[PDB]
Design a binder for this molecule. Structure first.
Ligand SMILES: CCCN(Cc1ccc(N)cc1)C(=O)NCC(=O)OCC
Length: 165
């Protein structure tokens, strides 16, 4: 019944910054929520722990989840390399929205982004599946290490991640 919660412990050039937690909307997008949850716990033997936010654009979003190529060209889901767009019920309404990155229709893997602005033009193209619950202040701190082209000025990593009770 209850939507699961996951956390990321963020580091900046290896130095701890803080925690971001997310509510995953399993009630509306169970398949997509389950992929992110499982990648966050690492229970399939692969996932987000140790990966980086490779693209951060202030006033837009923070993108991560590429644990196979580390640069925005890789990643894989718990269902295989790719899976379908589950639905587009939820919209990109503002800062804190958690949504899947993709390379065309039905190409979800492991890459995701956290919005730092309303990104309405992505509605119906990227599957929204969660939101920041606590630590939007930490997301805003991460965002300051981005740039217009997305290259980060320090290495922004998920030092630890998992599921909260
Ligand atoms: C041709 C670029 C596709 N990629 C990289 C990507 C590669 C594989 C997967 N599974 C997801 C994204 C993208 O990052 N596309 C843009 C995007 O998703 O932005 C969200 C705000």
């Amino acid at each position: 019944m209850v939507n699961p919660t996951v956390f990321f412990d963020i580091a900046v050039d290896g130095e701890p910054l803080g925690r971001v937690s997310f509510e995953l909307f399993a009630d509306k997008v169970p398949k997509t929520a389950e992929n992110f949850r499982a990648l966050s716990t690492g229970e399939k033997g692969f996932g987000y722990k140790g990966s980086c936010f490779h693209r951060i654009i202030p006033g837009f979003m923070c993108q991560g989840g590429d644990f196979t190529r580390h640069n925005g060209t890789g990643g894989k889901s718990i269902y295989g390399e790719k899976f379908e767009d589950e639905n587009f019920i939820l919209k990109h309404t503002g800062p804190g929205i958690l949504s899947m990155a993709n390379a065309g229709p039905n190409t979800n893997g492991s890459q995701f982004f956290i919005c730092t602005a309303k990104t309405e033009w992505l509605d119906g193209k990227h599957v929204v599946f969660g939101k920041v619950k606590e630590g939007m202040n930490i997301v805003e701190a991460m965002e300051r290490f981005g740039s217009r082209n997305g290259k980060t000025s320090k290495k922004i990593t998920i030092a630890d991640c998992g599921q909260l009770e």
